[PDB]
């Protein structure tokens, strides 16, 4: 392909750097050391996180103005529609994105007015739109894993041991308590890995060593991206060691968010919204936003779980050079609508836009030439994956979406 036009873009972005959501007794008990405190209330976007999102917004601006999808200077109000989930961290991310892609332009983000309820676009199962069946969910998650959860200790032996050494787990209150019971302090096996669906089927949670290690690995990465001086007690260094440690986090997201029998239910509203916005089908099912015919970019301010759900539904898999989290802070799953001017056949392309560990930690100015954001084209399962942009035919893509959705989970 050559000479195709970029007609429209949807950005499903993760929020930027946040403080940890929770500090449980388990998280304190698995290390003798003290977790460093954060300058912002639990779960909120940090000011540094906003600055990093704004830097990414400036890159998105340079990139799409180079393409021409965005004109020079301030975008209009019809050009960009930005919708955020109800969390503070997503709402502020959305505004910091606009401040970077349209600096001093006074663009405004939109969100569900009732902040005391989840937004079913981003959390339809939690919202009660559709329910998970526990029996089915245990069966199909084991099928995706390819064995019982007890195999995780062996599949991830080295990263689990690596995490225990970072935590100094052998000297921790939890280990001391295990030794009181005559058990050993094998961090990979400190407890069973367990999946629990709640009684109404509105929540599914993994707990145990993989879940904890995914949480703590993300915290270390957030510490690093926040530019904290002491990351993981200075016991985590080397890009090789970051990649292996965060493989626990990525594996947890694969199992609990990319498995289609969970992803289908949690991700159907977002997938319908992405699809209908990309082709600008303004009154199709799943198109809930007041999009103009002139819409050029739809920004969706969501979570790593949302990105992973969409990836599981579409069969997307990627690895990010110099970014060990597959769903990193402020990273965007970007959908492009490309059109052939000769016949007006359209195509869908998917890219993961992200900042590297150094780009985050050093708050680096991004630019098209010298220091661009990372951009990874992503192959789509069942798609034609044509050329450098891995293009999928519009009709092929719509067929895949139709097969992937759980239609009872629409809004």
Residue numbers in the entry: 8 to 418
The authors write:
By hydrolyzing phytate—a compound that inhibits nutrient absorption found in animal feed—into inorganic phosphoric acid, it effectively reduces phosphorus excretion while enhancing mineral and protein digestion and absorption. However, the issue of heat resistance has emerged as a critical bottleneck hindering the industrial application of phytase due to the technical requirement of instantaneous high temperatures during feed pelletizing processes. The active site within the two domains typically consists of two conserved motifs: RHGXRXP in the N-terminal and HD in the C-terminal, with His and Asp serving as catalytic residues.
Notably, the variant APPAmut9 exhibited a remarkable enhancement in thermostability without significant alterations in both Km and kcat values compared to those of APPAmut4, suggesting an unaltered catalytic efficiency. Superimposition analysis revealed a structural similarity between APPAmut4 and APPAmut9, with only a slight deviation of 0.53 Å observed for 409 Cα atoms. Through analysis of the mutation sites in the crystal structure, it was observed that the introduction of 10 cysteines effectively facilitated the formation of additional five pairs of disulfide bonds within the crystal structure of APPAmut9 (C147/C268, C271/C413, C353/C401, C101/C116, and C57/C103), each exhibiting distinct electron density. These covalent disulfide bonds establish crucial connections between diverse secondary structures such as α-helix and its surrounding α-helix, β-sheet, or loops, thereby ensuring robust structural stability of APPAmut9. In our study, we introduced four mutation sites (G101C/V116C and A57C/Y103C) to facilitate the formation of disulfide bonds between helix 95 to 108 and loop 108 to 131, as well as loop 37 to 59, respectively. The substitution of Arg382 with Ile382 resulted in a reduction in the average B-factor value at this location (22.1 A2 versus 17.4 A2), leading to the stabilization of the β-sheet structure.
